[model samples]
Target chain A: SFRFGQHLIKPSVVFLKTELSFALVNRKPVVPGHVLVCPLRPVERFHDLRPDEVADLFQTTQRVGTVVEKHFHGTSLTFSMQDGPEAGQTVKHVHVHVLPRKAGDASWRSEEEMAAEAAALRVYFQ
Target chain B: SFRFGQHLIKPSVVFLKTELSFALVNRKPVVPGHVLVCPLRPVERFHDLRPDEVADLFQTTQRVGTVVEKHFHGTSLTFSMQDGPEAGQTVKHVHVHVLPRKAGDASWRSEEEMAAEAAALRVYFQ
Candidate 1:
């Protein structure tokens, strides 16, 4: 069984009077303030998002990302979606990760290294 | 000045009768084979993508990600877009990164750690 680390910000369960659909942080993060945002509705991938929903999601991401940047002094942020398990969906639930990146962080430099780190970091949920 | 590492795989300059708009690997990748795919056309953010273009870009991302997953035994892959410099667009050319993630790799566990690494790793391009 896989175990996630301690909660980072109480899951943002309540935000703007709209309970967050689903949220989590990397137990093992590539960077700080790395956040995973998922819709409460269970859907497979990006294609699954209706046009309006997609727009909403992007806006939500931007809002949360702005928070991360301000609080963490994050130079920049990355928004990612791993559609399927084949596409590297660790969890069945659809989610997007918002990562804050700076510079000169590690020896693993390259897409391959990042992929390797991701592969190594997967922990199955019980 | 900032520097990108030695080129790996020669940039995939040409592909299937269509010249890639813009492509590059993270010189110091979070993982090896981490690839950035962007349109030759320069625009600012996801909202910038026309409906048809958005569809096409996603299709392209899927096609290329499939290749990465297959070629690298990549357990999964992540597709990310950093909208602007504030969103972590290292280059002005808009692009998406395709990353392969594995299991059990590093000590940097948590979004904060990953963000720290990113901060340290920023190398400005010449």
Candidate 2:
């Protein structure tokens, strides 16, 4: 288990874990393969991140992004981050929304659905 | 002068130029201080970027993002990238949309207005 802001993120929903960051399945996915990548520390602001963490965060993003696209059968991807509440950040922790997109692109998934997707994604890492 | 896809990006509109990336004023800003950061190369795909370029690109993003927040007097920021046409990318090149945000957060600017903003942002770098 991990914490995304004040919320508890189950281990089953976490698919990718890097040294300083992790990629988790979105409860309410904007698209089919929409996911989130975040620093393990739950830093609230992007500028507050250490240099090495920044590097690891995005490198992990790149890795997760490719796998998401492949699994979702997308031709492209969208990476977005709302760095604060004013920017529509529901969670105080820093998170980059990684969405696997196509010519057109969701909704809240049941816990079972979310866990299945996470399990599917975990295959790539192994 | 540089090219953003097929479009020519005037020097006056470019505020920050790093070794591998540059920051420019957005013509049609989504918000008051919306801007863009892009790689020097015209690569269209994010996955295609070399590891070095990826590091440079985001390190540059953090720097520009902080400055954009400071200059715009914003408390938060939004970073977005549409990696392909399918992802709603208007330009063929890889560019990240960096927006400075408030608690609540445009339209296109005129040539002179755009140039002035670019000039204003340039002050931060020097």
Candidate 3:
């Protein structure tokens, strides 16, 4: 299990892991194919991350993003993060929202469905 | 002048520059202290960035985020990128939106005003 703020995120839903970061399927996605990436350490502020953590975070983000866009048949991608309480961050941990996007778009998947997507995406990292 | 897609952004508006990336004041800011960071090149997709470019982009983003948050007296930060047209990216070049946020936050600055903000922020980088 991993900690996403106070919530314990199941490892089954986390598809990608690097030395200092991991990528997981979103529980309540604002848009289709929206997922999340976070540091292994649940730091709240982006600036507080160590330089190595910052490097590992975005590199993993880049890797996860490519797979996400391809897996969703998307032509574009969106990477965003709310770094603190004031910025609309519901969770105390820092998570980058990685979304695969279509020309004109736009989910909350059940746990089973979420695990399925994670399973499908994990194949890329394996 | 720097190219933000086809639009030539004045160098005066760019507040910070790393070897492979730069940060600038937004002409039409979505929030106060909203700024932008981009690669020196005009690549449209995030995945297309080279390894070094990827590192520089975000490292520069981190540095710029610190300055933006402090200058604006913001308690949080948002770092987002629309990597292609389908992802709401209006510019052909890739740029990350770096915004400073407060508890219940949310600008468009005129050119004269925009330049002043740029000038103000540039001092931190100097």
Candidate 4:
């Protein structure tokens, strides 16, 4: 189950790698450079993560936002965790989403648009 | 604006407090003892939070879950941030939701249920 850079279709875009995790752009890009910070461990849920792992995860998430703002030049970033099926956790693996945002990014338009995108990505991940 | 324990409708449930922030139960109880860790600062958005504040927010969230599990005896916890209006952020204040979950908590049922609950709380906040 351990393959370095294994399932990722694009590797050149990987911006940072920490001791416990790495971050890369979402290949399909609901918006360009939409990034996911995923732990190397295949933990199924957020509650299953150890305290240190959870701390490391969001610390890396914050660092990625700083880097994204420096390089991508977005006004703000949205950090989110869709932890379960009920909260729209599409992927079973625990991952944190760090989405870069300009003032008028269409991706931030509406819940309908967001839900449509999540549904579309479900197909892409399949 | 600096009123210690002034705005809270219920105060007995405040389980923990740190220098930067504090944790308290959701008065309406989406689930019994649903918790929120809010910073003392009055920033409205996640992007506006200082790096240390962001880190401390999640750190307190994790600690709240540990305490919730120990006291509430739940199988898992859900940590979420509804960062902006588009993502259903009702409150302008920056706070992280720390919801305790059992095997059959009704709060985990569906998005409509969650949305309905959020909408109900909007009235309560008003």
Candidates 1 and 3 compared by lDDT, better number: 3
| Interface RMSD for each of the candidates | 5.2, 1.0, 0.9, 4.1
DockQ of the candidate models in sequence: 0.20, 0.78, 0.81, 0.17
lDDT of 2 by residue, A1-126 (tens): 788999989999999987799999988887889999999998898988988888788888889999999999999899998988888988899989998888755377799998999999999989
Instruction: Pick out the ten consecutive residues of candidate 4 chain B with the lowest summed lDDT.
Output: B1-10
Residue-level lDDT of model 3, residues B30-99, one tens digit each, is 8889999999998988888887888789889999999999999999898899888888988788789999
Mind sharing the TM-score for model 4? 0.60
Docking class of 3: high
Best candidate per TM-score, number?
3
Instruction: Compute the lDDT of residue B79 as modeled in candidate 4.
Output: 70
Runs in model 4 lying further than 4 Å from the true structure:
A1-10, A27-34, A45-52, A66-78, A84-92, A100-126, B1-11, B69-74, B101-126
Model 1 CA deviation exceeding 4 Å by range: A1-77, A82-90, A98-126, B1-28, B106-126
**Decoy 2 TM-score against native:** 0.92
Across residues A7-115, which tens digit of lDDT does each residue of candidate 3 receive? 8988889998888999899888877678999999998888888888887888899999999899889898998988888888888887799988987771556899999
TM-score of predicted chain B versus true chain B for each candidate: 0.62, 0.94, 0.95, 0.71
lDDT of 4 by residue, A1-126 (tens): 222223532334455567777665554556654778877676766767776677677777777765654455665666666665545566677788876667666334444543443344333223
Per-residue lDDT of candidate 1, residues B1-126 (tens digit):
111222222323222112333344444456744656665455665555555454445555555555555554667777888766766565565567887655542322444443443333222111
Which sequence of candidate numbers ranks them by DockQ, best first? 3, 2, 1, 4
Q: Which scores higher on TM-score, 1 or 4?
A: 4
Instruction: Write down the TM-score for model 3.
Output: 0.93
Error of 4 at A113 (Å): 21
Docking class of 1: incorrect
